Amino acid sequence: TQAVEAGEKTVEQFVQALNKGDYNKAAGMASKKAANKSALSEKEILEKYQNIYGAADVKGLEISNLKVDKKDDSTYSFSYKAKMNTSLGELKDLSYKGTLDRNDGKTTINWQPNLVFPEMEGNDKVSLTTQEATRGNILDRNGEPLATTGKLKQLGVVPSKLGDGDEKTANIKAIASAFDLTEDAINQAISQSWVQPDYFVPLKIIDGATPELPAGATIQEVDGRYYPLGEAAAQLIGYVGDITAEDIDKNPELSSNGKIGRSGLEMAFDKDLRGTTGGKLSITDTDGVEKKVLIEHEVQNGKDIKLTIDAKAQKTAFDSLGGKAGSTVATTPKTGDLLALASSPSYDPNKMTNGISQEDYKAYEENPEQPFISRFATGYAPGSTFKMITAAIGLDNGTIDPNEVLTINGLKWQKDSSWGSYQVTRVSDVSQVDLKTALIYSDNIYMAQETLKMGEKNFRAGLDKFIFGEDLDLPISMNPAQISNEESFNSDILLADTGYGQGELLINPIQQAAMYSVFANNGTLVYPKLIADKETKDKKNVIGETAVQTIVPDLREVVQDVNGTAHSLSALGIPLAAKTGTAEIKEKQDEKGKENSFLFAFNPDNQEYMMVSMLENKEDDDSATKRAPELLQYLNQNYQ
Amino acid sequence: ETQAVEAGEKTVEQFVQALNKGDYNKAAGMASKKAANKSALSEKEILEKYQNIYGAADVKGLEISNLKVDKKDDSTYSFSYKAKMNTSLGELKDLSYKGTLDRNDGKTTINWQPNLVFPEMEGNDKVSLTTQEATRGNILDRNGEPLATTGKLKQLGVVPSKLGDGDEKTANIKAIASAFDLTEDAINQAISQSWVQPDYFVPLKIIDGATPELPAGATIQEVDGRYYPLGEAAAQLIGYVGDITAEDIDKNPELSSNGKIGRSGLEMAFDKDLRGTTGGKLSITDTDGVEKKVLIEHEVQNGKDIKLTIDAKAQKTAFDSLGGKAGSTVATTPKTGDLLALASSPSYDPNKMTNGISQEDYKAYEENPEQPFISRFATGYAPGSTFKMITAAIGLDNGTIDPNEVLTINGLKWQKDSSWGSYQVTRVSDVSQVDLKTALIYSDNIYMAQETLKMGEKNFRAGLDKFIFGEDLDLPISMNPAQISNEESFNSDILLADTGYGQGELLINPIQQAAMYSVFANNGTLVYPKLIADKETKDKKNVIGETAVQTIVPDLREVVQDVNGTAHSLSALGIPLAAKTGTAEIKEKQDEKGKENSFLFAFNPDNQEYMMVSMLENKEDDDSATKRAPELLQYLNQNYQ
Q1: Which CATH superfamily is domain B312-639 in?
Q2: What is d(CA B322, CA A439) in angstroms, rounded to the nearest whole number?
Q3: Percent helix, strand and coil across chain B, each to the nearest 5
Q4: Neighbour tally for B81: CB within 10 Å
Q5: B165 touches chain A (CB under 8 A)
Q6: CB-based contact, A418 to chain B, within 8 Å
């Protein structure tokens, strides 16, 4: 109907005008206080919709069902349902019944308080008496908190105490310099709506101590989420952020204000960690009387999540990367307990949840070393540490014998001229190489040569006993690990490189530590485990016991022999079986790209700890085993 | 070894697919620049030569052949393929191409030169345009009156956003439909259609005669198009045409790159003869204009005309007499088999199927439950009680039916025993003592089923196999051979008795029904129907004996002349008629309960000059095909004498 075509539109656009918080568009389109029915004056919605929704912060009003009929010559009526979300939880449902007005295009709604709530007599106030639930903690193995609530410093200003003029602008400068803010953020944080110069407007939330206080600045205590390790655990733990309307749209069960996880475990365990706040609306009628309030809730605190993480080992693993790109995973391999999941470089989770400028958020996003990435959950080529695996498969299927002695001359080898420029590279020119020599000197030519004999079928049959393609039961995103891009290599180069961990393998450090724990479990593979009360899951006979008793003594010699590639760790005087690794990522736009350093290490005398550590795009004499000591000493002092 | 030439393979394939779809940006988007060992021109100077030669000839459908990619150097390559190409003038078959590739950064590049596009020239020349279009031929009726023709038309329509907005928008629809004999929701329907929007011109109606002053939004366009004088009344037979799709040229490589093509009916069946061959002189040249050799040269030849047996006025009379109901009607001259009328109702307007498609309306009346796209005259049905005359004819031939035999039938329903359950053959008039002639007059199904059971199944099939069951008729109409049954044996007394009066698994379309019923106008000879006027008459001798004809036809006149005949209303016409009515209820051993159909067969038994059969699906009683018969009958009697 062309006459009332603006009758369906001019109610839903008002409902969305209340959704986005612009109450004056809503309270700007009413006729007057005419006697139909009463109703209420044009300018007497001044404190209404603002002082009732300031403590409520209600958003998410949606209709989903609109059909308007006719009643009189000048009356069209409502009868439909709606829902919304306020500070006290979900309010479903709402029944709306209101009348229209007959005008020349100005389809004016005759609002009376029945259209806000399904019954409202008039001229009455409310009482909130709210109580706020606390978010659940995230604890380590020993109950040390990785995410909890702390007392923070709320920084703000009141505009009247800054003065006027060049003295006021100089105070604005002094605030911006002291609070590490901009002048423009302060100027339109103040110069906005709802402001009057004696109002305390907030500007920033600090975890550390109070800075310099120029005239106008104002300090307050505030309760918020705190991360005692911060950067050292940021990618794992994540951060929380304020509720937006878009999260209300995905899950209307949420509140209107409050916190929501945006990454890491805070997003992964958001439902368990959140809980529900307490308090009720309590519409009075200016004497103490209560009518009745329909949909309401009680208080319920969030639940705690306890991890297998060792906080001190997490910090030692992160600090040992020295701000460079890399990742470190440590486990107790008999159990699968993830002791540390460090990813570097990292971001500051406290500043991300306490208000971070767009300056710094893009500086984190502009950083080519990508500090937002969970590198322990990112697939890499494992590097030449993976020689342990193919050696193990070779001792299982009878194609690799430890007495076999290959003659290799030089540093470079290719199968024929068909390989063109590509050739397998090694570091030490050792003429006579058996398997133990290959493992001590990290000889890639030996294993690639012994991967082409014992070809693809024997090789992939050994690899298929591992966890390739499996989704691990962990609260981390984690692509499954792949052998190669396709079901077959279709080339000797790819097979040969797969033999020493290059090529198209993609294995993240966590599933990399899963595959490597067979050397501490006599061939049984023990799955990683992050939640401290999940029961252990293994997978038996992935490799044979005799492969383990052949390889692990040679991995001891990787440390103990002066020619060992991890001989520097011999100086620590602790029992170690180790494997170093390289991987050359070519980045096929220029030649001779970046090289990553790897270290696998565990204690072979008690099997109580294991570590895999990646250092990505190393520089000269910089390696993952150079960075490993302080974590190793910690692990064997405290995991025996 | 190396995979560089597989990138050259995919590059040549993407280059061909970019030339075929027409995007000359991507065709010149992976070429080199002006050099001595690279592409001959720049990027903006290669698109300039495609859009005025390939785009001028509307070059579509490059089909690749035996693509060889090899390697003579490390930076340059050598590819040599064969192909075929479709032009405005038709199709060139055998030609050889070659070229050289390039390597910069892992992705490969084609080094262009002006003989990869034409196999003998080198550069510095242009060719355009030299085509001479041909006209599609006519489909004519028996007397030269056209049923499909090409010529100039005037059609009306609307164009947004010159319809406007607000009420002033709908204010323009109130002036159009008022002035051009239309409705308003149809105007709102054609703008609410698919992606075609807004500056396209959306057609509404063909305008005859002078153009009035137009209201806002109204748009008149003059087009040289395909027209159908009878419209819906022959839409199923004639069909409609559309534009030539790349799919249509993939199925037939001999077609020209553009033009019109039949999409249904006779226009599809005769498309090659109806179209012609364009003329032109697409050649190779130099910059001045002198030529060395030619590529394609053909004298233009317009499409040929195809004269049918159809009578335009009888066809229109047969279609209007169905009154929009579901049904069919076939009319012939039985001595020669000329198909005078082939009417199928309901129908669609073929002029709107050519002048636009109207996708939202296409799906609207192709999922119409009355399914008007179906050519019901080529669709197999149960022939109904009319088929008794065939069973009688077989019975008097093989001796198992004698006219003097009187059965005693009491009631209106009959079954052989109770092993038939609830099923019973039904009659309409409760006549106690019924001979063959009584059973043809009153249309008594119970006499015929009884006499069919007494006759063998082998006696019955032996007579049926002298008809055209399983034969492919030599007609340019798609149809299935008519069937006696789903299986070679009935293996059921119910199925056999019902087949005896035209029900069961018997499937015969109205054109096949006219062919079988022609024995009664040719003394037992079956005359095959023909649709093309010049085709020789085809017959089949002694399908039934002539004494059976001289027994049955005197009874068919009394179906009209006797007060109890089921076609006695036709006796008011005062014209000599022999007739047989029929019914068929849609329920058998292996189907769902549906409706009732109302058949009529009639012809002149004095001069054997015309014959009709009409079906009228979903009778909805107070109606029958005998009720809708008389106007086509008076026309046939006056014009085929």
Answers
A1: DD-peptidase/beta-lactamase superfamily (3.40.710.10)
A2: 94
A3: 30, 25, 45
A4: 17
A5: no
A6: yes
Q: Which residue has the tokens 């009346």?
A: B365
Q: What is the resolution of this structure in A?
A: 2.5
Instruction: Specify the 3-state DSSP secondary structure of A110.
Output: strand
What tokens appear for B249 in the block? 């040229």
Contacts of B167 in chain A (CB under 8 A): 2
Contact call for A588 and B167, based on CB within 8 A: no
Scanning A561-603, the segments in alpha helix (DSSP H) are none
> A96, exposed or middle or buried, with CB in 10 Å at 0-12, 13-18, 19+?
buried
Tell me how far apart the alpha carbons of residues B636 and B611 are, in angstroms, rounded to a whole number: 8
Burial classification of residue B630, based on how many CB atoms lie within 10 Å of its CB (0-12 exposed, 13-18 middle, 19 or more buried): middle
* Region of B48 on the Ramachandran plot (φ > 0 left; ψ -120 to 50 alpha; else beta): alpha
What's the token pair of residue B318?
């047969």
Interchain CB distance below 8 Å, B1 and A588: no
What phi and psi values does residue B614 have, to the nearest 5 degrees?
-135, 150
Q: How far is B1 from chain A (nearest CA, A)?
A: 7
Name the catalytic one among A256, A263, A384, A613: A384
Amino acid at A386: F
Instruction: Of A615, A640, A639, give the one whose Cα is nearest residue A308.
Output: A639
Q: How many whole angstroms separate alpha carbon B374 and alpha carbon A155?
A: 80
What is the C-alpha to C-alpha distance for residues B594 and A28, in angstroms, rounded to an integer?
Answer: 64
Residues in chain B closer than 8 A to A588 (CB atoms): 106
d(CA A333, CA A527): 9
Pick the CATH number of A311-638 from 3.40.710.10, 3.20.20.370, 3.40.50.700, 3.20.20.70: 3.40.710.10
Using DSSP, state whether A279 is helix, strand or coil. strand
On whether any CB of chain A is under 8 Å from the CB of B289, the answer is: no
- Please provide the size of chain B in residues: 641
Q: How far is CA A551 from CA A384, A428, A557, in A?
A: 15, 20, 10
| Nearest alpha carbon to residue B101 among B22, B30, B20 | B30
Here the tokens at position A140 are 């380590």
Residue B375 among the catalytic residues: no
Three-class SS state of A314: helix
User: DSSP character for B386?
Assistant: G
Distances (CA, A) of B3 to A485, B10, B13, B108: 17, 11, 16, 11
Report the distance separating Cα A354 and Cα A359, nearest Å: 15
Q: What secondary structure does DSSP assign to B561-624, as a single string?
A: HSTTSTTGGGGGG-S--EEEEEEEES--TTS----EEEEEEEE-TTT---EEEE--SS--SS--
**A592 interfaces chain B, CB cutoff of 8 Å:** no
Is the alpha carbon torsion for A140, A143, A148, A152 positive or negative? negative
Distance from CA of A454 to the nearest CA of B (A): 22
Q: What is the DSSP code (8-state) at residue B282?
A: E
User: Most distant CA pair in chain A: distance in Å?
Assistant: 106
Residue in A closest to B167 by C-alpha: A2
Method used to determine the 3D structure: X-ray
Whether the CB-CB separation of B302 and B277 falls below 8 Å is answered with no
Candidates A141, A130, A559, A522; CA nearest to A311 is A141
Contact criterion met (CB below 8 Å) for B460 and B498: no
**By the 8 A CB rule, do A519 and A548 touch?**
yes
3-state secondary structure A135-175: CCCEECCCCCEEEEEEEEEEEEECHHHHCCCHHHHHHHHHH
Query: Helix axis angle, A387-396 relative to A444-452, nearest 10°?
Result: 40
Q: What b-and-e string marks burial along B527-536, b requiring 16 or more CB atoms within 10 Å of the CB?
A: bbbbbbeeee
